[PDB]
Every structure is written in structure tokens, then in C-alpha cells.
């Protein structure tokens, strides 16, 4: 997720797991956080921006979201 | 076996923390340690102290003693000739 506000925002994740499985879990989280920082390549990121691309176009649909919008 | 997910049972306690770059390592140290040291030392020293002047008392009298032993006495040679 990320939540903008006018100065400042919160840039993380959420997750829920069963209690003998949060270790793991976290340990996950953050070693993708590290490989994008270090390692990122071109086709994953392609990836990404084609699901953005659909999000954004599939979330104005109807009179309701672009009133809000 | 004992490991942190399984340890024991508990309901309802929150807690709270910073980071340690967010505080000071050695916050307030003479207006709070100093006193709280003191009183450490006020609440044992009784439990403690005692013993040890006991044997300090003891060690100097068997030291005394044991050098008062050695010197020549001199009804051992005076009382009979």
C-alpha cells in the first residue's frame, strides 16, 4: 500500500499469518524490498507497468468514481 | 522445542517503543542515576558489610598475636639465677 497525504505519507505492507509463521514472512517482505533496491531488471518492471496501466483505466468506470476522481 | 512462537499464553498488554537513533544512549545520568545508585547501595549494605569487618577485626588480632609470640620474655631467664 501506499497512503499520500498533502506533506507526508506511509509506504509499507499488511499481512496476516499464523503465529508459528511470522518470521518467515517478514523475512520474505524485506529481502524483496532489498532486491529491488539492489537488483531491479527491465522485464519485471514491464510487468508492473502494464498492471498499472490496467488499474488505473479499470477504476473509472461508471458515473460515481469519476465524479469522485 | 522452546522457541518464540509457542511459549506461553497472554491477553491483552501493549507495549511501546522508539528506535534507538530517534533517543540518547546516556539520557539524564546525575539527576537520575546517581541517586538510584545510592539507593542501591543503601538497601545492601547492612546484608553485607558486617561480615567483612569481622574478619578484617579477626585477621589483625591473629597477626598481632602471632608477632607478639616471637619476642623473648624476659622472666625466662631472670626468675631463678
Not at chain 1, 26 to 51: D, H, P, Y
Not at chain 2, 8 to 32: D, F, N
Amino acid at each position: 500500500f501506499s497512503i499520500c497525504y498533502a506533506d507526508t505519507g506511509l509506504l509499507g505492507a499488511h499481512f496476516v499469518c499464523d503465529r508459528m509463521k511470522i518470521d518467515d514472512m517478514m523475512f520474505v517482505l524485506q529481502g524483496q524490498w532489498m532486491r529491488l533496491c539492489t537488483s531491479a531488471t527491465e522485464s519485471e518492471v514491464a510487468r508492473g507497468k502494464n498492471i498499472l496501466r490496467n488499474a488505473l483505466v479499470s477504476h473509472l468506470d461508471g458515473t460515481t468514481p469519476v465524479c469522485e476522481d | 522445542g522452546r522457541e518464540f512462537g509457542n511459549l506461553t499464553r497472554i491477553r491483552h498488554v501493549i507495549s511501546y517503543s522508539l528506535s534507538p537513533l530517534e533517543q540518547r544512549a546516556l539520557p539524564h545520568v546525575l539527576s537520575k542515576g546517581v541517586p538510584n545508585m545510592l539507593r542501591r547501595v543503601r538497601e545492601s549494605f547492612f546484608r553485607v558489610v558486617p561480615q567483612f569487618v569481622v574478619f578484617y577485626l579477626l585477621y589483625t588480632w591473629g597477626t598481632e598475636e602471632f608477632e607478639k609470640s616471637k619476642r623473648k620474655n624476659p622472666a625466662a631467664y631472670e626468675n631463678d639465677k
